Design a protein around this ligand. Structure first.
Ligand SMILES: CC(C)ON(CC(=O)NO)S(=O)(=O)c1ccc(-c2ccccc2)cc1
Ligand SMILES: [Ca+2]
Ligand SMILES: [Ca+2]
Ligand SMILES: [Ca+2]
Ligand SMILES: [Zn+2]
Ligand SMILES: [Zn+2]
Length: 164
């Protein structure tokens, strides 16, 4: 099921930093900060990594909301289709996570895509996980809203392969 990028790219330090460069107007700023914090929390529990929010361009994981072509040669596409993308660990753009703000970001059952759930998937990519072929798993490449615990055995096995 689980996959890794073709060098098995991974962080080589334990104290990962992240910077929320900008915000969507879809949700209050404090709701967005907490959504991202909760998504890191899923991953910190199961690895030796910690995640510390910083306010610097030197952060490992830089998080941005953007539309269409937005500075990395991999353009977004308006509403629906692509929701977000992230790059495997390494310097600069690597490890960064981008969210399509042409999408409607929400939490809970209803309109839009759960920022928490999408961020959890994207942060998986930013730690080194590729897509899983196990349909029950967070890294399986289909968004489904759920209230249940996001991590699957396959996700934890994968992240253990990289940091365990
Ligand atoms: C299918 C793939 C070509 O496209 N994705 C880009 C990507 O890989 N982002 O990581 S996506 O934006 O549509 C997408 C699809 C599913 C999810 C996802 C899956 C499970 C839970 C939450 C989100 C996130 C983005
Ligand atoms: Ca980075
Ligand atoms: Ca889109
Ligand atoms: Ca939006
Ligand atoms: Zn991008
Ligand atoms: Zn993905």
């Amino acid at each position: 099921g689980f996959q890794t990028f073709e060098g098995d790219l991974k962080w080589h330090h334990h104290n990962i930093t992240y910077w929320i460069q900008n915000y969507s107007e879809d949700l209050p700023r404090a709701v967005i900060d907490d959504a991202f914090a909760r998504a890191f929390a899923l991953w910190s529990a199961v690895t030796p990594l910690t995640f510390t929010r910083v306010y610097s361009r030197d952060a490992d994981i830089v998080i941005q909301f953007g539309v269409a072509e937005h500075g990395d040669g991999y353009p977004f596409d308006g509403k629906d289709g692509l929701l977000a993308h992230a790059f495997p660990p390494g310097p600069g753009i690597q490890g960064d996570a981008h969210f399509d703000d042409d999408e409607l970001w929400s939490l809970g059952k209803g309109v839009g895509y759960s920022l928490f759930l999408v961020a959890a998937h994207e942060f998986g990519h930013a730690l080194g996980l590729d897509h899983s072929s196990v349909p029950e798993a967070l890294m399986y490449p289909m968004y489904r809203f759920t209230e249940g615990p996001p991590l699957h055995k396959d996700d934890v096995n994968g992240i253990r392969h990289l940091y365990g």
